[PDB]
Amino acid sequence: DHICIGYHANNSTEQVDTIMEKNVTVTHAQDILEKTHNGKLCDLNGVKPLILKDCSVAGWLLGNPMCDEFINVPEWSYIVEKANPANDLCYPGNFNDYEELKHLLSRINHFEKIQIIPKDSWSDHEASLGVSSACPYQGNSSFFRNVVWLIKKGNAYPTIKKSYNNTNQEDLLVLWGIHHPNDEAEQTRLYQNPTTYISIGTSTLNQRLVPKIATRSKVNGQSGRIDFFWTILKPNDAINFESNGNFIAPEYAYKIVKKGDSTIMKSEVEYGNCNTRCQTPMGAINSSMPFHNIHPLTIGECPKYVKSNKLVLATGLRNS
Amino acid sequence: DHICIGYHANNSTEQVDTIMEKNVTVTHAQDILEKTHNGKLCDLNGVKPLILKDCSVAGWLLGNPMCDEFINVPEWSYIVEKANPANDLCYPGNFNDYEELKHLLSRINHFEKIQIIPKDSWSDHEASLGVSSACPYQGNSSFFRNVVWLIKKGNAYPTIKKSYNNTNQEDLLVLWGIHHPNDEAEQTRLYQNPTTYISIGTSTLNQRLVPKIATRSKVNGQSGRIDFFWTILKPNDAINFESNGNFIAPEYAYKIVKKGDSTIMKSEVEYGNCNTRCQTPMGAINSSMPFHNIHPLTIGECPKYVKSNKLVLATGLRNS
Amino acid sequence: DHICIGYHANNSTEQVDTIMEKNVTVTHAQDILEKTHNGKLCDLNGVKPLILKDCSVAGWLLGNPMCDEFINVPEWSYIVEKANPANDLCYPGNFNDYEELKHLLSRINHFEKIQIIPKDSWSDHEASLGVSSACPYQGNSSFFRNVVWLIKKGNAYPTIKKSYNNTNQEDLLVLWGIHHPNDEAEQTRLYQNPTTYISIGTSTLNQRLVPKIATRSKVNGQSGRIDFFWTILKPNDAINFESNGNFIAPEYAYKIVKKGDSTIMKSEVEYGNCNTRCQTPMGAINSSMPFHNIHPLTIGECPKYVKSNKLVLATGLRNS
Amino acid sequence: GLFGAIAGFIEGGWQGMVDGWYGYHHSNEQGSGYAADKESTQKAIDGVTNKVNSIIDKMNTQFEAVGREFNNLERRIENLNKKMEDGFLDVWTYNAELLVLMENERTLDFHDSNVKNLYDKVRLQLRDNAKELGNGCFEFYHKCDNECMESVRNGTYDYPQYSEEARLKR
Amino acid sequence: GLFGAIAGFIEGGWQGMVDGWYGYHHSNEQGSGYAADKESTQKAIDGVTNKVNSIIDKMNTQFEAVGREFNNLERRIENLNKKMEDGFLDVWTYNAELLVLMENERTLDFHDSNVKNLYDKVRLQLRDNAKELGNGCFEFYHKCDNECMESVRNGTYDYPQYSEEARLKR
Amino acid sequence: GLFGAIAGFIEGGWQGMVDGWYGYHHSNEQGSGYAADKESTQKAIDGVTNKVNSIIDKMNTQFEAVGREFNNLERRIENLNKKMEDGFLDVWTYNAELLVLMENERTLDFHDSNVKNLYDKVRLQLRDNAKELGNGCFEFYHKCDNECMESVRNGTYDYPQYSEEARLKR
Numbered sequence A, B, C: 001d002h003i004c005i006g007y008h009a010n011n012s013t014e015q016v017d018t019i020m021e022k023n024v025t026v027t028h029a030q031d032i033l034e035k036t037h038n039g040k041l042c043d044l045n046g047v048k049p050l051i052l053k054d055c056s057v058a059g060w061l062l063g064n065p066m067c068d069e070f071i072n073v074p075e076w077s078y079i080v081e082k083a084n085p086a087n088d089l090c091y092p093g094n095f096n097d098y099e100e101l102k103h104l105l106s107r108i109n110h111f112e113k114i115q116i117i118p119k120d121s122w123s124d125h126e127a128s129l130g131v132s133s134a135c136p137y138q139g140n141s142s143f144f145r146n147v148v149w150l151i152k153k154g155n156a157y158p159t160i161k162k163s164y165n166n167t168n169q170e171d172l173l174v175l176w177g178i179h180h181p182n183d184e185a186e187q188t189r190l191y192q193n194p195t196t197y198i199s200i201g202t203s204t205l206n207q208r209l210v211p212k213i214a215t216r217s218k219v220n221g222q223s224g225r226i227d228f229f230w231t232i233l234k235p236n237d238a239i240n241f242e243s244n245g246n247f248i249a250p251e252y253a254y255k256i257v258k259k260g261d262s263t264i265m266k267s268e269v270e271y272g273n274c275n276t277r278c279q280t281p282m283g284a285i286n287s288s289m290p291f292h293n294i295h296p297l298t299i300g301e302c303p304k305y306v307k308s309n310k311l312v313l314a315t316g317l318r319n320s
Numbered sequence D, E, F: 001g002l003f004g005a006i007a008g009f010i011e012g013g014w015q016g017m018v019d020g021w022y023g024y025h026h027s028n029e030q031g032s033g034y035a036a037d038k039e040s041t042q043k044a045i046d047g048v049t050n051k052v053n054s055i056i057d058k059m060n061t062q063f064e065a066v067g068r069e070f071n072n073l074e075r076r077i078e079n080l081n082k083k084m085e086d087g088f089l090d091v092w093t094y095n096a097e098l099l100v101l102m103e104n105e106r107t108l109d110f111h112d113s114n115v116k117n118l119y120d121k122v123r124l125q126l127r128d129n130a131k132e133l134g135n136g137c138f139e140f141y142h143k144c145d146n147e148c149m150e151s152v153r154n155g156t157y158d159y160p161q162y163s164e165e166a167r168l169k170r
């Protein structure tokens, strides 16, 4: 009469690793690493991203004319921008504190584009002359739509005094610019006054900008440059502009009406009319696993990222 | 005749965790995590902190008149400052490289406040006119005490040339300012000369400052602004100031006479006439434990910080 | 008849540590920690380093006259510079964005020193007068060799217009300077024109520099200062300079012809005519071990760095 | 193994045993076949299940990358940013792999320990009342019904009972 | 346990044993009661004490937060600062918890291993000169004085002595 | 040890054994001396060798310092740089030391486990056909040739053979 003590076994081929032994075949294993993605960009819990296509963030916020698609943007779950967008600044120049702005952006889900200085309020100055071949719209010359390139009116440029008070409850993103001509002739031909400035003040901002008249390379066919500058105008604060030339005035600004979880994704991956709880620059993830290896930069509720190629937990015993 | 092999047991309820099993009751345990604090701010090994109360570091070093309590400060073990001190700059403006200064501060235990330019040495300029309602002292108008707001003397502002050589063995913190008026009338009414500057030189410093005359929001009832600037004047170096207006001159500077372990604590927790070897923004720690969970930012000899809620070491065996 | 079960033993004294027991003598151990170095600086795989000796990186790239040894430098595997090189700037001043430059440097193995503005091309200006006692060469006065200190020619300083187009396939490092005099007399004595500027433009650079005439400490016997500025001139871009005084013009620039693994080592350790695969500021390492403890900052193929004093792996069993 | 039993004194596993993890095999006139243990398998299920949750949970406070941009005059801080994010990515990749390597070894030795523990709850109740082949099998100095085996399973093997024909079998 | 002895072949613990950690119990005409082991308990005291110091000491090179301030145009580097300090706080919180979880398991199995080791220093000296109940108790094929037990404690149990009445008890 | 055998029931090590790690000693009329085991030593060689490579390999994704310079108005970020590099240096110094401390303990207990496993592959084949001294030695109830020991080494000890003079020796 014969009784034995023994253990389970099966026809399984799933392998684990240990410190002493690799590929120890086991009875029961649990893979805990997500290795795959749907290869599309998707809605994040029902909210569509903003796909900037061929436009950069600057091109968007200044309103480069090739970016008309983005004149009015709905609320987004996250932002997607190419590595090298073709439409940025039609007119060459610098965008001051650009990265700090994108950082701000990344904590923002929606803007309302509001008008802060009316294009009809410039009686003593020309407000539509005012365009460049560097920024074309359908063959004809144009300019960034959110700002107004003021020009002299009949051989004179009186001192602009303009202010705007923030009567809203939300912060405002205000943008403006300075034109740097190539020589002093174009300086007089544009603004009459040879020596000029732009002062900009708020309760925390105190800036004076002076044009830099100099000879540079043509970029986009221009040797002149335009530098853009921004601030966050708080509720009940006012912004005051004073200039006697070279002023690229605001027309519109952006009201910050929704804040929360966002990011600016770098990707070329097509939007694919899907919906996900976790998104990566390479594609979306639908998994119950706690680890993945697709990309470090994700948004949503995601598995934790690792660089591993395989990651399996032995649950059963050594197979035979 | 009967001999047995067995183990200790007791009426204990102390529990530990392990990878497979949680709350395994044990015979002997050692809690290694400090979870409590005395809830007061204390002396650190016999040296009292500097409790800035309602003043900020800037308010202190410039000598905002509401901060008279700090005209002379004894050596401190650490500094405590509120989240939003009410007395900072009575007169609105910028404090240049403020955070870099606080960083310097944090490695400093004591200053000697010395006089570097005598308030009696301005014969060709008015040195007491010189005050604003923005910085009141007992109803009447005043100014930051460490600096002197120079004004024109009888419709003239000759060029200031002033220098000071550091005859001490310690480094010096030197502070000075520039006034930015609202319009060119106040500019002439204050300093006579319409176009002005402040040059400041040392063996490493070479600065020119120009006033920015512009229209801004009233802050503290003022639209003018004052920007403050500092340097570390080395032993045997000299500092040279040249100005033809808008100069907020030094009167006093701070000699760095004690360096070592300090920090700038953010806290609202009352000082409590006690003494400790380890201090946290929430309160002091008196423990022999090697870990605590009170706050990451401490000073003194402290347990190492963790985010754990419980941390107990099993020393004995499983209980029954 | 007697058969036994037992284990190996030996006369060994090599000890290991474990969690419960320290210095457990063992039968077989493997030390995995490299603790020693040859104490010389060496070639890195056949390529000699650049030993700057008594010169700093700035002194080199501007061509301080005491650094003639480095007028032409072969390709290097890494750079070695002292803690406090005696030859930096013969003439006192600032080197703008110095650290960002060294960072660039550190990814560079070789420059070609090319001529971008010919010293013979200044017909309307004096190009050899032009020197200071601050920068002596063999008793007589001299200047940084890579740049040209322009002076007025016969009581006049016409407006310089000079440009240079990058006809090469490699990026260029371009350097230039501005002179800040002590008083307005020396300003007129040097450059005739009292109010001056330097504009510098590229496709991304747009700079205006204004001299700061002020009183400072003598440093190297001078109270005047010279600030140096640089850019990376891309292939097919041009650089344009315009100035009516105080211009310290480029003569030569550096072509970036080899990029790859380099570093800037701080060390006083003599070069020792050896060759290594792994180099540290303290000396070279020749080892098969996977860990060392010599210094964190190494170059080459190296063991991973730890702070441990001993690190031994038990391979055998407990000795007797 | 480490406890000598799996891939040791008990050479292989029983395909016919799919009733559980660690079981018995009874072989008497009435019938052959297998039967698993419950207070042995289940206890191993909890321990392995709890361990898995523990590993995962211990891992959810791990570092999460964030994108930050920089201009061409911020090369030092951008490089600092890159090295500090890879730095943490490498730490957590190290931690997860290493906690998997180490628990795998323990999970395997846990099983082995639980089989050897089983072989010893039966043996230390059978005394000199049975044969020990040493292959993970037991032969009797007496007769055993199908529900007699159930006594040695349940843990309630009656010693002041079968001693007579055991001692006299010698 | 993992070594089958604690909460295994030795069901529970002895409240009356507060003399030490791992002990014996003698029960002869002269007197009942408990007595602990010293070369067994003490050796466990060192090992557990050393382990504790090791854990703590291994932990004093851990990351220490530092406060740094930033202006409103330093948002990227302030965020970098925040993530790198929490980053290290999380690493060290992970390390300390995990080293506590893992050593707890080992400390428990160390004890278990030391009890089972004890049961086998007595058994492998008693041979066929005594009964093995299998509950962590031993009955004799001979008579044992109070200072006879002290022979099996001390380790010096005399075999070329008691063999006569043991063999003849059968 | 942890498995009771090294520095336990087998007091010391055999200097005369330099044939391998875990061996036997035969002592019959023909000749004394030692002989090691191969399927026991070698299996321990692989396991220890693989472990070493594993530790090292697991360690080559470790943090590598980089020098970055800063001006006197970059004191906050330079300090940030210093703390983040020491931060990682401390983490990896912690990891390497701790993985060495922990594997050392395991390597030692692995050996111990493999000796005790050996003592039990012989014992569980010898049954009642031999004496068990309990010191890591075995005496016979029968006669054994030099190539008879080789049967208990090879694993092929013939039981349906020597049973006659073993049973009758009592």
Ligand SMILES: *[C@@H]1O[C@H](CO)[C@@H](O)[C@H](O)[C@H]1NC(C)=O
Pocket (backbone or CB within 6 Å): A022, A023
């Ligand atoms: C383990 O198996 C995998 C098969 O994918 C192989 O990559 C690896 O080299 C093997 N190593 C060992 C020890 O068998």
Ligand SMILES: *[C@@H]1O[C@H](CO)[C@@H](O)[C@H](O)[C@H]1NC(C)=O
Pocket (backbone or CB within 6 Å): A165, A166, A236, A237, A238, A239, B216, B217, B218
């Ligand atoms: C903004 O206008 C509001 C509304 O009257 C007022 O309270 C506030 O003072 C104004 N701010 C400025 C900067 O003028």
Ligand SMILES: *[C@@H]1O[C@H](CO)[C@@H](O)[C@H](O)[C@H]1NC(C)=O
Pocket (backbone or CB within 6 Å): A286, A287
């Ligand atoms: C996501 O996975 C779940 C679970 O298997 C499934 O119900 C769903 O179809 C998946 N979604 C997509 C887009 O395939």
Ligand SMILES: *[C@@H]1O[C@H](CO)[C@@H](O)[C@H](O)[C@H]1NC(C)=O
Pocket (backbone or CB within 6 Å): B022, B023
């Ligand atoms: C362990 O006990 C604590 C009681 O405070 C409880 O929080 C936890 O959920 C328990 N877990 C288990 C496994 O019993």
Ligand SMILES: *[C@@H]1O[C@H](CO)[C@@H](O)[C@H](O)[C@H]1NC(C)=O
Pocket (backbone or CB within 6 Å): B165, B166, B236, B237, B238, B239, C216, C217, C218
């Ligand atoms: C500072 O005065 C000392 C004392 O005579 C002198 O050595 C030094 O040159 C002076 N420095 C300046 C900047 O004038």
Ligand SMILES: *[C@@H]1O[C@H](CO)[C@@H](O)[C@H](O)[C@H]1NC(C)=O
Pocket (backbone or CB within 6 Å): B286, B287
């Ligand atoms: C600090 O703890 C020690 C040790 O128990 C004690 O002597 C002392 O009274 C405590 N200090 C305070 C302020 O309670």
Ligand SMILES: *[C@@H]1O[C@H](CO)[C@@H](O)[C@H](O)[C@H]1NC(C)=O
Pocket (backbone or CB within 6 Å): C022, C023
């Ligand atoms: C271990 O031995 C070394 C000898 O170099 C000594 O530094 C250390 O204190 C010793 N510790 C113990 C536990 O023996």
Ligand SMILES: *[C@@H]1O[C@H](CO)[C@@H](O)[C@H](O)[C@H]1NC(C)=O
Pocket (backbone or CB within 6 Å): A216, A217, A218, C165, C166, C236, C237, C238, C239
């Ligand atoms: C550089 O010269 C090349 C060669 O003709 C030309 O393509 C390019 O436009 C020039 N760039 C500038 C800035 O003039």
Ligand SMILES: *[C@@H]1O[C@H](CO)[C@@H](O)[C@H](O)[C@H]1NC(C)=O
Pocket (backbone or CB within 6 Å): C286, C287
């Ligand atoms: C480097 O070590 C190797 C290996 O032992 C040896 O061949 C060589 O001589 C060593 N090089 C020097 C410079 O000593």
